[PDB]
Design a binder for this molecule. Sequence first.
Ligand SMILES: Nc1nc2c(ncn2[C@@H]2O[C@H](COP(=O)(O)OP(=O)(O)OP(=O)(O)O)[C@@H](O)[C@H]2O)c(=O)[nH]1
Ligand SMILES: [Mg+2]
Lengths: 448, 166, 166
Amino acid sequence: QMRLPSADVYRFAEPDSEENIIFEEGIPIIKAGTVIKLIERLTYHMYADPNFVRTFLTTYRSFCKPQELLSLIIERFEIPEPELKRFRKEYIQPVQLRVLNVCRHWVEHHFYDFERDAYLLQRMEEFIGTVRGKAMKKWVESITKIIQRKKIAHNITFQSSPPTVEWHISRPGHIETFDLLTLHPIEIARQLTLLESDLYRAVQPSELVGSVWTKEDKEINSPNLLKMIRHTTNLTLWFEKCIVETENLEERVAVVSRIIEILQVFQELNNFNGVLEVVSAMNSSPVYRLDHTFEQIPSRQKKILEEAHELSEDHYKKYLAKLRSINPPCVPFFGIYLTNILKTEEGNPEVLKRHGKELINFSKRRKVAEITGEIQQYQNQPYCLRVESDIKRFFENLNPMGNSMEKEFTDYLFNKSLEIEPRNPKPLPRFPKKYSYPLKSPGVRPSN
Amino acid sequence: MTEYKLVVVGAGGVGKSALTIQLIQNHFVDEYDPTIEDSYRKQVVIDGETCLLDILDTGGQEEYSAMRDQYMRTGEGFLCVFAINNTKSFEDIHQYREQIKRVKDSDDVPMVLVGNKCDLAARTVESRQAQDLARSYGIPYIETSAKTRQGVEDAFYTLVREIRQH
Amino acid sequence: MTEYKLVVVGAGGVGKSALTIQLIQNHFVDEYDPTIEDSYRKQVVIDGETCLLDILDTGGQEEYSAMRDQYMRTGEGFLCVFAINNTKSFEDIHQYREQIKRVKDSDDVPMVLVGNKCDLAARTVESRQAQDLARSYGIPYIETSAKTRQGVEDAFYTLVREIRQH
Ligand SMILES: Nc1nc2c(ncn2[C@@H]2O[C@H](COP(=O)(O)OP(=O)(O)OP(=O)(O)O)[C@@H](O)[C@H]2O)c(=O)[nH]1
Ligand SMILES: [Mg+2]
């Protein structure tokens, strides 16, 4: 049995009770607790739980201000001694190290808190600067270098070597000829996967916690997430344009096929975002109705597009299962996450009351942390695919809608659909070809 | 038993998510988990008839505009929601109705107009206003306060009745 | 999918973190920032089976024996690391092996012996020596290089294989 300081000289000594901490029914899992009780477990001396640090530092802002967090972890660091060598070894040391762990993490991965509040940084520097002791010296100097590093301002090693860039009708350096059919479907998929993979990897938790991407300053707080969704929406729309603007049935059939091949390579690359960009295009109002066009799509392809569409069926039942099984790298579909985060935050109380005592509902924050954590896990692994500057540039600059407002363009596309394949009983007219090059696909097998 | 596929459309910020949650969820449990299997399904009795409500709420994915048509098509009935303190969302109601009518390829699609109270801000869309819009479309109008649970069941059940009587 | 809790132990500076980060993001951390206790996660398919790795990277030789015991209670498998260019580090290995054995109270706790930094020429520990010590515990020995990436996957996945067959 180890004695703790007097709860009168050290607030974090109060014994646990149903009135300040609740546990979920293998270390303990905190359902709810008081800010004090939380920070006590945040730096508990009995066991280790880095997950708690990430969780807490990702979501604390909803129940505790930055300035206050600091003041509290500082109080936690300054522990009064009442065996003394036992208490130091089993209580003060672990705790104090863990408080320094929280400071290190806070400054390293949530630095924006200090960027937006200069006095917080000042206090942090001052605090770190007051940590005396040869022991803590190691860490103190580290947190310091990290802070300075962060104030003034990533290589990749691969198992194997990236495959060879594939070309078709368009040749290196002739960006003016680049188009859906003249580029190699394999590279199209490849380049778009990298692009989309970077876009995904760039999204930070701060753009997600608090449903901020859905609020009015979403443009200021969730720039990367928005930039990502918008690329996806454009790509989908481009696919739709390409299809309804190719009026000749024989050429149009050629286009949809190519797109389905691209989808196939996406599947291969685990770029589920791309998969859905395609599925969504095919299911759009303009495309969905082109019966004469899908009529002529080979059966192997129709099967590919159907299996892809089944992923989203029954609330992404199969999609979720497949991501849980594949082997990264992969580009997940962000949409799913956005909905669960939002719904988790709206369907759960910010606090639970026990005997008139509002305890922060931590299980709510833990749940949202699980989601952001899941996102981050898939963000680590980089694709081993060589970039093609020009092709890259090509898709980065695609602008399907031009200067048209969404609705106008949207109606345009649908009308286009009605023109190239009129509602029955109206008769199916014939249209002149538009591509002056061969429409045969180079297939999706990489040349070696 | 019959299964109805209900879709909840509308501009973001109007509480669409509080509606679905307030319907499905157990209101006497501390924690609620959306990621949990079939937390979107619920068996209910409507006018003595038992059926299964399968609800599609894509709250938070509003920005993914190109996926609208896909999500909407999976539905038999639609809940067009707008916040009563947000005029823009109200005005968006029309386009949503047109978009639904398009993918479903019908001028007669089961749907309900829902005015939702999200908070205590000043109301900006007057009951009568929605009333009149709902009538011009020839569809029912229900006002709700998803947070105080008022109106939610009415909103959903009314729609099921629409589907049945279609 | 099965979950495997792996723990990386060994004297400071040897490469524990560098190894994990390489495994995790395929990035080599050149600078040296002492680790207190961090936690990583990785979904990877090993031998056609999808796992989820929880890698607990610990702080080494910092003389905090009190805490080290806490890390080893949870771990299922351990990656004991020493640098082939630091004899002391090699000499410490038994201390860790003994401690794990003590804490978990078992003579066959899954684990691998890793001689990191094999991209450096100034080797001071010979593969034979390490190989023997490995055989004495009845565990495999892998020479790795967080810098070039050499043998990293093998190190970790092998450990998975042993927790898997235990
Ligand atoms: N050239 C080379 N340098 C390495 C290798 N592994 C680690 N290093 C270098 O050694 C230093 C310390 O590596 P870390 O991985 O932080 O050591 P550690 O075991 O985590 O240290 P603690 O967490 O303090 O116990 C770093 O500056 C790395 O760049 C390796 O395989 N090759
Ligand atoms: Mg380290």
